[PDB]
Amino acid sequence: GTSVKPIFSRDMNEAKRRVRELYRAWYREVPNTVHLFQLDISVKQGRDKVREMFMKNAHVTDPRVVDLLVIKGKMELEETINVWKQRTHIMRFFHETEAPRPTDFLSKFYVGHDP
Amino acid sequence: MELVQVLRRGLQQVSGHGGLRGYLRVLFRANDVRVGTLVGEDKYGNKYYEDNKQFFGRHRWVIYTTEMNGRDTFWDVDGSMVPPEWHRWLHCMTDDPPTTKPPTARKYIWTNHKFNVSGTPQQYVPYSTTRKKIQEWVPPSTPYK
Amino acid sequence: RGEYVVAKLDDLVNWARRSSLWPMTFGLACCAVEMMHMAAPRYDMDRFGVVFRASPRQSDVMIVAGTLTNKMAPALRKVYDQMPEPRYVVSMGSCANGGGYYHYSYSVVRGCDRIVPVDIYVPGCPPTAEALLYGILQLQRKIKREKRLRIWYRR
Amino acid sequence: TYKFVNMREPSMDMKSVTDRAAQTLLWTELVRGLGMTLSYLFREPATINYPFEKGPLSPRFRGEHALRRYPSGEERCIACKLCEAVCPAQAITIEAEPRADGSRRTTRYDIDMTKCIYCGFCQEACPVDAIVEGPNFEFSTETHEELLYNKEKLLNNGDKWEAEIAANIQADYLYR
Amino acid sequence: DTRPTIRPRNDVVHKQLSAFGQYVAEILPKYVQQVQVSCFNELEIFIHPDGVIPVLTFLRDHTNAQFKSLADLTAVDVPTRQNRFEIVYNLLSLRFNSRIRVKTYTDELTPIESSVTVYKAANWYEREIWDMFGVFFANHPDLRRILTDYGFEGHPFRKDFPLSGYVELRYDDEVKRVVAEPVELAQEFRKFDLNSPWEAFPAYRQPPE
Amino acid sequence: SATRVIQLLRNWASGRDLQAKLQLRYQEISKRTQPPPKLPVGPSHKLSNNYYCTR
Amino acid sequence: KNFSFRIDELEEMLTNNRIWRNRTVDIGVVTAEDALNYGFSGVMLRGSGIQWDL
Amino acid sequence: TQDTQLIAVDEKLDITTLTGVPEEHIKTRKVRIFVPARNNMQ
Amino acid sequence: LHHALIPHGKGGRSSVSGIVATVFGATGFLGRYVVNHLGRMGSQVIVPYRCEPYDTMHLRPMGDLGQIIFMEWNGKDKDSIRKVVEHSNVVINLVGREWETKNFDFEDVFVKIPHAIAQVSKEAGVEKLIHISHLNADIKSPSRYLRSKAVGEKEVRAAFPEATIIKPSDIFGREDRFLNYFASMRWFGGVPLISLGKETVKQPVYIVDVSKGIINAIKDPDAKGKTFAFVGPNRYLLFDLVQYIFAVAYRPFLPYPLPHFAYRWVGRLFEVSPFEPWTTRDKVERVHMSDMTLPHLPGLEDLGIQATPLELKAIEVLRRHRTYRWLTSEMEDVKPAKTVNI
Amino acid sequence: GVRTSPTGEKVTHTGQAYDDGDYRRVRFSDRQKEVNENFAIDLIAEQPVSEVGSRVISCDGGGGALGHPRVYINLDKETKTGTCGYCGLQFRQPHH
Amino acid sequence: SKVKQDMPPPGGYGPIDYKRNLPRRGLSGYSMFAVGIGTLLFGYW
Amino acid sequence: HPAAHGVLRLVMELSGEMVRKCDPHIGLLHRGTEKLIEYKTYLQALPYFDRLDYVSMMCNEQAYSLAVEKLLNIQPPPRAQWIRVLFGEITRLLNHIMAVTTHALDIG
Amino acid sequence: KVDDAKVSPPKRAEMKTSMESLIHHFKLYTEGYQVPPGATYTAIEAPKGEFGVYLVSDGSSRPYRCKIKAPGFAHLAGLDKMSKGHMLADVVAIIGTQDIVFGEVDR
């Protein structure tokens, strides 16, 4: 039948726990991340750039997808603990140099055939 | 006896290389004092030598010219003054000089072989080789109808 | 004449520069092993007056040889910026020149020039040991053709 | 069948053991490498004098592309696009147009070396031997835009490099 | 073969591998589904996903099989199936100089028990497969990216993943270190739909449908 | 291709007859002016009885 | 013909050399089981005494 | 069908958040399918 | 519009924006970031240079192939500018030196060269021109710098009635020689300041704000004729400037009161140096004199540009000058100086 | 033979010429738009037309194997002169 | 004409050696030692 | 590193100089070779294998060639196989030459 | 090469003279030989190890999946096991005794 085998999160509750200790590791990670990683951004914008990515994926109802994502969350997390990534690697989360993307209909009409 | 034999070989070397001036010329520019048979001499002044007795890869060699197309090269040189007819002989792609059998001469081949024009104003530039594809509707010349 | 004097000191500077420049012991892919092919006694890297030093604080000309990847990119720019001036860069092979055989690949940056300034683009895939050994020669000629302290005098 | 490589138990004989002891105390096998290295020093070096001297090559060498032409003067290319279809890195871009006369060759023939692989596949893919891998390995340059040629320079390259390949395909036309 | 063009055959081996194909079938009827030896003497065992670790254990352990070498790990992706990724193993038996192929199927979400315990060679082959295809396996020691770029999002070998990728990078002087941006090629991949419109092999043709 | 005295020195320091054959190449190589070849036809180049269905 | 006289040149330089040997012998060892368990092949197995060659 | 702590997650599969194609290329891309038509001269 | 000029692509490296840039003297701080943004969105940039091509190579990895073309050029020779600005759409003037050299005087690079670049560009027929003049450009100012900007601005205004003159207040950034100036001051013992620098308020602006404002002015169809003044977001006293930047460097600040004439003398000995001077008498007046406010002149926000605070971007420069004892220290540890903003 | 565009730059064999209002021409400044002097348009017209006496002729392009693949062109149209598409040189009947 | 390609000589190429040909050089350990003291004892005299 | 044998990130967690952990971060050279393999034809796919390992030029496509024609139920002519094994052994010499000497290079 | 011209290009002399050679050469150098569907794991004795390819053909003129077996991949995987108790100079010895090449170990 349509019933499926979960890996770690049987339902939303345990999955909601797993996204919580991601915050638990991340929140105490951002301060010394900036400290160790020679970053010039402050902790304040470091904290909420972890925030909005939770709402970047705050629509999935399938527990497996949350579980499939919880592994990657600690993967990028662990990649930051032992300085494996470089400055540009974490800067890629900080969208900083690209041109702003148009939003209103007048802007994309004035830009080109982009729908 | 063989010791003084190589000493006179050096004494032959200075004598055969146009005396002292030529030997000091090749020693300080050609970086080598070896003497080889005059296999050929192209139209650009590049002097070529051949020594079959030496080990492979050091049998055929080139003394570059001091002038090419107003690009004085007495001191500086590069591996591109070699004309197309002789460039195969230098790299021993063949055991024939162009003098023995010249290549088939045709109309369109260059008369003056050139070198890397990079850096010089004669350098190449990429450009479109295609015509315009969508030409616009020309506005009417007449004023308001 | 002042210009005569500056030209003479100019001639002293580049001659030492082009005679004693030190390529980096940097190698990535197929081009790297052919780069050490000419360093073998057949073509004699050293007889042209150059020796291989390792760290950025050590060498003169970066010799980029191999495919450039996204993961390789941060270190290459870091190691290139870490070389004291004057510093030069030559780009071995089609792959490092730009894109290469993997130009369309997801994990290859299309051009080492997209990351680091380049003096000479030595082509071939792999470039024959003869071709790049000229590329060093062209850089010697390019180093010869400068007016660093001469442009300063007229600056 | 196999050959055992590393086991030879040394004899414990007085003569043999004092051999190893003499080898240990008096560096003997150690100076053997030192001593032979002297013999190899007196060998004359196998170094060519570049660019005054250039290494050996073969007629079937792959270098810079050069579009050739018929003895009359008409360029061999007839826009079959087989070179484009085979080019493993899509370094060839081809556009064609029937212009006026028996000379519709290319609107565009751009070979992208920094994309090209120098496999030579275009050379034997050509039914008319138009595009060839020239014998010139020496075409380096300082700008990235240089390392690509247009259709015109391919013609100029075939014009400038003409005697070498004409003789090279002359010697190699039976092998391939 | 009196004709020197076509490749010969080793019917003795073909039947011999087929005999061992049915051999495993009775041994583990729960896990194998169908066992097929190809025309060119390659006998493949097709096992169920959940029974991945036992069959590999059986081939490593059993005297009559003694397959102890993890040659390669592949998970060939076919979009037309419900669980697309079919994970294919590769084993070599030194004592019987023969190769076996055991394979399963697994969608993007179903986890597989990692075979690192049964084959230490699976370890790094495991770090690569999750990178390229994106199929997570369970209880792996240090399952983590070992092929793609640090923080590179998306499994590049997936069918939905374009060959050109999604992002490209370039050094920027205003920030004095390299930075990424959406991919915008100088030359796009000119697709070459060169597949012949005429049937090439009557033997392998699917039944009418 | 050197003096006899050093040839003894090289032959004795290395303890082997290097002069019989050396690393560098000499005129024992084949000349690079080969006569034109006459490459053979294949087994299926038979003018008759060469139907593709049989091969 | 000339090459066989050159591996002996390398082997004279290295194999009998104690300096090469000390840095090399017994530095990095694999047992029989973990050799083919780790997926090694070619020289890695052959050095470990595994009787296998493709 | 294989009872291993099975839960009835029958909602439509949404792997987009995991495959993570960019927002412009997941919404603003009309994906269309057909059977290709045979080339007429063929 | 020109047939092969319509903008194309999604503003990338290989895209087409329709801007044939002709930035002059791009081998500088303003030029480095200006060509960066022009190259980033995708636009043909023609960069004339006078110095060694080696120094100009750091602008090579700044755009797609064949988008940046380096051209030799000379200020005195009229034909040199003509070649550079012939195939052009926008010619922006970024030439000018903070000190005086024997061949080129202050008026030469700030009036004579802008006079030539404006006349040739108009004669050639480029649609737009942007000129850079100091926001404190004043004909009666004690510094020959600001006087030269004022008359130079007047000349390019008359020669080019549609030129968009840019008025940056006090640029700062990595190689900015403005805060690098005070940062390098710790080498000479204490920190010499005229009357302790308590009577000078400046409003610095960081590079990207003026840089982005340049192309925004290029893209703006109504920017012609205007005299946009690019000014920072906050005003601080001169003492507050040195107080803050030394704190971010954690170097021991040693205030040192100076008479005006002694500081004027100090510039004289440091101007003797045949190499690049460190301190000039003109620089003495510029740092002493205070930034002025011109509300009537349009600012930088009108072009959709937000002035980045100095404290936010000061760390990007101060990290290099700070010692190892505080190299990894963050920016929240330091506290922005007392703002005396309008 | 190479012509010259009104802007003073030589035209290529395909007829491409950069417009005077064009901006991308500046790549030619301090450089050259070199053009192959041997125009294929003018490199085949002056070649003589042969007068073979046969209905159908195999054109090889010269050199045997080195030439283009053999093509059997036809000479029956009296008003038109036969030619091989591979090479472009002319063929003609013996005045019939 | 008969078919000609690159072929081995009619008798075939010469015998290619592959084994070790390492020389046995030097002198006996006793002789090397006896020399060592022999010159050594000369030294103290 | 010159002892890196090219490019890789080998992080050692070591005390003194006894290596405790030697995690070999690989992929610094990564080209999606198998991905571009998917879009090229078999003939266009041949040069890919020639560039897998820089030590054995035609040992690689020998495996790739054996992959295709053996799947194709086609065999090469007997003379061709002798050329393949002859050059494969020459290719075997090619790797072993710097499999040992570059070993000695990092060794000293 | 195999006399079957459908898998190997015909000779140049025949390609310029005979129809079948030319038309095959045109289509072989524009489509490629059609490989039947299937999978194979041919592996040869590479100078390092057992370099092989898991070629998987869908039946068209282009391969579907081709995974490269790299002997270095396993050898570099075991590098952690080899280096244990040895020093930093020894691990320099080990990574050369497996002859790791990073276009192959990495693919």
Ligand SMILES: NC(=O)C1=CN([C@@H]2O[C@H](COP(=O)(O)OP(=O)(O)OC[C@H]3O[C@@H](n4cnc5c(N)ncnc54)[C@H](OP(=O)(O)O)[C@@H]3O)[C@@H](O)[C@H]2O)C=CC1
């Ligand atoms: N606070 C400030 O510094 C302010 C500065 N400005 C002006 O804005 C511009 C910013 O310049 P920036 O990018 O920082 O560069 P720099 O001031 O550091 O250097 C001068 C720039 O112009 C070029 N240049 C200098 N002298 C000449 C000359 N005689 N002829 C031609 N070109 C010359 C230089 O390149 P090269 O040396 O190779 O010729 C370089 O690009 C300058 O004109 C500056 O005075 C405006 C407002 C405030």
Ligand code: SF4
């Ligand atoms: S250009 Fe060719 S040889 Fe060089 S790294 Fe790329 S594929 Fe290898």
Ligand code: SF4
């Ligand atoms: S060798 Fe020829 S066919 Fe192959 S990529 Fe280069 S140009 Fe194209």
Ligand code: SF4
């Ligand atoms: S170069 Fe040859 S293969 Fe390519 S289009 Fe021209 S004729 Fe055809």
Ligand SMILES: [Zn+2]
């Ligand atoms: Zn014809």
